[PDB]
Symmetry: C4
Subunit: 82 residues, 4 copies
């Protein structure tokens, strides 16, 4: 699967995660984007996290949808530049 296709999937995941967190949890766009990266990279600082049942479910789906996508994208990125 081409690296650029994976990148597009990662972009869609970022949109999904950011919009989801902002509207379900009510955080700013900037915090939501930052939380999305932190979550899909599996860093998970816990400075931000869902506080509602829907936010928690949503976060599980994001984890399922995003962690593999992101992992493959970074390693393809690594190959590409190096």
């Amino acid at each position: 699967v081409p690296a650029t296709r994976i990148l597009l999937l990662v972009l869609a995941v970022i949109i999904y995660g950011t919009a989801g967190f902002h509207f379900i949890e009510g955080e700013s766009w900037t915090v939501s984007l930052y939380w999305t990266f932190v979550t899909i990279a599996t860093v998970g600082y816990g400075d931000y996290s869902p506080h509602t049942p829907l936010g928690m479910y949503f976060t599980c789906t994001l984890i399922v949808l995003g962690i593999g996508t992101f992992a493959v994208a970074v390693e393809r990125l690594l190959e590409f530049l190096i």
Copy 2:
């Protein structure tokens, strides 16, 4: 090993982790499920975590039982859909 077999193993891990956290730590079913995903994906926000010696041991076993299972499942999921 077939992707669906791995999925079943991941499901059993989720049951194990959720029930374990709920009964050992006393959190709600919903929090326990969410904590299980967050732990086996290695996100680990720390909004929830074990507060007893048995919960801590249990979490170590979950980590050992769940992180590999979950990693293989997501990457097999990725292959399957893409």
Copy 3:
């Protein structure tokens, strides 16, 4: 490299991490063991973390020594049982 050799390396890493955290940071043996697993699996809840400069350095070495060892051990464990 044989799976059992890797297991022994993981055991040594666990001893290293546990003893280190207990004596440098002053946490209980049980907390230190739990923190070691949580760190080398990269879960990192942040319920426990080093609060001194030596603890922070030590944690960086543990991260370097432990995360690869642990990752290979779990995947070898997965292959072995499945």
Copy 4:
């Protein structure tokens, strides 16, 4: 790609992350180094994290630049010594 080349890339990532966190977030050099390792290993305790919009953006770039680099370095390190 030679292991030593990867090591150099990891070193540059560490400089990038440490200096960035220290100057953008204002933490000590020691905390910033420790935070950099904790972030690029994806441990993410959350004892330290960015509190400004620029720090959050910067952390996303560090995550993108550092997690793949670091993962490949540790596994190459593992092969080399074992």
